Amino acid sequence: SSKIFKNCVIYINGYTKPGRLQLHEMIVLHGGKFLHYLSSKKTVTHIVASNLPLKKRIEFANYKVVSPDWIVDSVKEARLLPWQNYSLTS
């Protein structure tokens, strides 16, 4: 229980470790929200993914795209870590 991820709406794209359900639980337990699908950029704040194929680099251009480590390490540190430190792209 915390509010680390308050004001975060996360969408997880593709395979991740930890897995989707485990990350969703961590997000909800620590104050955030998640989406099952991404119909628009209206509310999502961060995309979580292990890697980006070219087509995904295009689709998620101008999105904050970070590794699942961002969720894990933030929970472990009891503090929201800078998303840039976990960005998949420069």
Curated annotation (Swiss-Prot):
Limits of the BRCT domain: 1-88
Top-rank taxon: Eukaryota
Localization in the cell: Nucleus; Mitochondrion
Outcome of substituting residue 32 to R: Loss of activity
Family: Belongs to the DNA polymerase type-Y family.
Subunit comment: Interacts with REV7.
Additional remark text: Present with 521 molecules/cell in log phase SD medium.
Function: Deoxycytidyl transferase involved in DNA repair. Transfers a dCMP residue from dCTP to the 3'-end of a DNA primer in a template-dependent reaction. May assist in the first step in the bypass of abasic lesions by the insertion of a nucleotide opposite the lesion. Required for normal induction of mutations by physical and chemical agents. Involved in mitochondrial DNA mutagenesis.
UniProt-recorded name of the protein: DNA repair protein REV1
Organism (species): Saccharomyces cerevisiae (strain ATCC 204508 / S288c) (Baker's yeast)
Residues of the full protein shown: 162 to 251 of 985
